[PDB]
Design a binder for this molecule. Structure first.
Ligand SMILES: [Mg+2]
Lengths: 120, 56, 117, 110, 46
RNA sequence: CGAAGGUGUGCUGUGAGGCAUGCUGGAGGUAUCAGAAGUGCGAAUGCUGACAUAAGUAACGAUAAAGCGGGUGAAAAGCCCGCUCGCCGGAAGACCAAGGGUUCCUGUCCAACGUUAAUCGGGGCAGGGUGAGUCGACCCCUAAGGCGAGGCCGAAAGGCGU
RNA sequence: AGGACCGAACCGACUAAUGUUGAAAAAUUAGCGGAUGACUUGUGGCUGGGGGUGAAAGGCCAAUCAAACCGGGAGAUAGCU
RNA sequence: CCCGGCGAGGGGAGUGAAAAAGAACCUGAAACCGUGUACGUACAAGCAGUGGGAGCACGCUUAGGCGUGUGACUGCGUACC
RNA sequence: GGUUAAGCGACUAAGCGUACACGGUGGAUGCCCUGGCAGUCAGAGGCGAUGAAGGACGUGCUAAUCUGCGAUAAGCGUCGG
């Protein structure tokens, strides 16, 4: 009954949740700005931010481990080279959420999530 | 399970007494453009805490 | 010749709803309910036209008894002495006297007490 | 001067739209528009268009004083219904009702 | 679930068609009745 | 200079009722006395139309699954493009018969339909699209069977049959 | 060789659950029987209502059957509601 | 002409005797659904009315305790066929 | 005039109820009829192999339907008004 339990369900099973976060995590780092619902964004930080922390140290083992997530070499290629140095001097809080109202199709809590600086 | 007598409009009206919407009052006022927006939300043109957040 | 009942029927319905103007909900809008309400109102009006005489008669005796006992005599003794005095004042005026003019009622009780002996 | 602007045969139930109408009844227009455009209902969008229509109705056809304009009378009346057939189990048919609404907004400076 | 009506134009014409009706005295009675009633589609053909 | 009808008020009769008038209505109504009824509705699980209730509740139709960026657009979870994720793959692929009868393609629109949004569609409107000596049909022949000149039989209709 | 065996397509419907204003006016899922024969299926044809057909249940004969459906006798009759 | 999506819908101007005749178009009732006003109702139990009845609001009247609207409380009262 | 205590006490309506006014849906009522029903007086009481009744398809400056017409195709020739 959710006593000291973490991990939202999002009306999906374990396989769909893992794949959807994996696809969304790669999309976010590729563009540095995506728009998704508030519960999706809030659980996305528990995925991309640990991934960035792993990407802080560059090694053959870390890159392979980072490749096991997001299942994409180009996403791993951008990591350890671009987002590494930018977040090397930062301890957590790589992402922030910007609420932007509700959709007109289903009236869902809408929010942007992006990196800290985005170099823009 | 179904009615035995027709409920009147008085019962119907009293049941809808708790269905009234709660209108917002004091959403926010921007510190840069001074335009109405939700609390802890960006404006129409991506303003939050004064500085740009969307860059269009 | 064919006769259309659309006008006379509507007039009768308006008359019944007119007599049942303002009871409750369907009793003032639905003829099938208003008609029963109108008839039951008639029975109550006929019944209470006789009950009103009994109701006011009950009230007058209660007020006369209250005033007489204030003077120190029961209602039954007051009327018993009142009859022996050959006084034919009904209970409506006696209740009227007892409320508005106190000294007049004190005259009635003194005469009744005097005529009682 | 009273200014009348209405929307007829709006594709929404009278009960649904009325839930938004009572939110802005008698309020100042400057804030009434804010409530409607920040309300998360479809009926809010419909009544907002009517309210904005009344606003330009009271300036292109009436004199002045947009700031002091106040909504006085607002009410939603049920309109003509459309009869549709929705098939059900065991060959039974149910006649569903699609209810249209008339949204009337009256605004005046006084 | 196979329903009662399985369409087939060839069987439909040979059963209730104009030439099938005119082949019997009873069919002429049917056509005469429908002509009297004034139905637009006298028979089932086409 | 305001008929019938509708909607209120007042007066009046033992009652069914009657009269006057305000408003709407915008063209017929009809005294008195007689005559003829499709002549008076609250019920018949009455009939027809309209509108309530449950109630803004159940439900939105296989638990194969969506996410993101850009574009059009007033508005994009549903439309288009691209990247992924998943599903079928002796089918959820491809070609036909039967049946359907323009649902096919393009341009344009969201009145009604799509169990929601709609710019989308098998929706609305307009235009276009089906090219055979060799494919099929048509055509020659025939099975089951149908019809049937003469003929036999049967009140008539008609039945059987060369 | 088999009215043989196990088992797909195919045919059928024994058990359980769901569904019971359902996705469905008998279905779905998990199981189940036959599956070279007394098998199944496509196309066309014939048997018509006191009749047809029936490995026979008075079962089926257009979502119906101890006498199908439509029209007519017919405004049948009802000591009943 | 304006709002509105180059919509739907609406408001002006104008025609018209009348647009309270706008094509969903003569007259436009009731059920049903609303807006505003007047009164009552959040310690009171039931065929919801009836008799009494304070209070409140409006028209009276030029006073005269009148009428209309509601009905705190109270006796009686278990729909129709 | 102040403190304390005791007693009494309206003004609130989330909603609802009653009356009135103003509206919506609805299409009853009133009025009307190039539509029906029943008759009276007259005619005709049949059409067709010289191809009937009834239909399909075409025919206009035509996209559809109704009506007429039939590749001479909303029609052609003659005689009259
Ligand atoms: Mg009323």
């Amino acid at each position: 009954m959710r006593h000291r339990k973490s991990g939202r369900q999002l009306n999906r099973n374990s396989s769909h949740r893992q794949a959807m976060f994996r696809n969304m995590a790669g999309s976010l780092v590729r563009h540095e700005i995506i728009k998704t619902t508030l519960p999706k964004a809030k659980e996305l930080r528990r995925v991309v931010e640990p991934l960035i922390t792993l990407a802080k140290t560059d090694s053959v083992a870390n890159r392979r481990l980072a490749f096991a997530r997001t299942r994409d070499n180009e996403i791993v290629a951008k990591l350890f080279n671009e987002l590494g140095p930018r977040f090397a001097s930062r301890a957590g809080g790589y992402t922030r959420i910007l609420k932007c109202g509700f959709r007109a199709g289903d009236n869902a809590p809408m929010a942007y999530i992006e990196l800290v600086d985005r170099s823009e | 399970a179904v009615q035995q007598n027709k409920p009147t409009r008085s019962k119907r009206g009293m049941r809808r007494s708790h269905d009234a919407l709660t209108a917002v009052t004091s959403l926010s006022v921007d510190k840069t453009s001074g335009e109405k927006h939700l609390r802890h939300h960006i404006t129409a043109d991506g303003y939050y805490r004064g500085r740009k957040v969307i860059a269009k | 010749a064919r006769v259309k009942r659309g006008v006379i029927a509507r007039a009768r319905h308006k008359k019944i709803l007119k007599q049942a103007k303002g009871y409750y909900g369907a009793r003032s809008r639905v003829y099938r309910v208003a008609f029963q309400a109108v008839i039951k109102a008639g029975q109550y009006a006929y019944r209470d036209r006789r009950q009103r005489k009994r109701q006011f008669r009950q009230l007058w005796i209660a007020r006369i008894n209250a005033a007489a006992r204030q003077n120190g005599i029961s209602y039954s003794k007051f009327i018993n002495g009142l009859k022996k005095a050959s006084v034919e004042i009904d209970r409506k005026i006696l209740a009227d006297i007892a409320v508005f003019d106190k000294v007049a009622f004190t005259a009635l009780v003194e005469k009744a007490k005097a005529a009682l002996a | 001067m009273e200014t009348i602007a209405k929307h007829r045969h709006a594709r929404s139930s009278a009960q649904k739209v009325r839930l938004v109408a009572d939110l802005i009844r008698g309020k100042k227009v400057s804030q009434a528009l804010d409530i409607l455009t920040y309300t998360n209902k479809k009926a809010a969008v419909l009544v907002k268009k009517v309210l904005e229509s009344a606003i330009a109705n009271a300036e292109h056809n009436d004199g002045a004083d947009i700031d002091d304009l106040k909504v006085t009378k607002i009410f939603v009346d049920e309109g003509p219904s459309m009869k549709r057939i929705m098939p059900r189990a065991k060959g039974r048919a149910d006649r569903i009702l699609k209810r249209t609404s008339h949204i009337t907004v009256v605004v005046s400076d006084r | 679930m196979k329903r009662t009506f399985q369409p087939s134009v060839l069987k439909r014409n040979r059963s209730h068609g104009f030439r099938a009706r005119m082949a019997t005295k009873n069919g002429r009675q049917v056509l005469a009745r429908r002509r009297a009633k004034g139905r637009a589609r006298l028979t089932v053909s086409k």
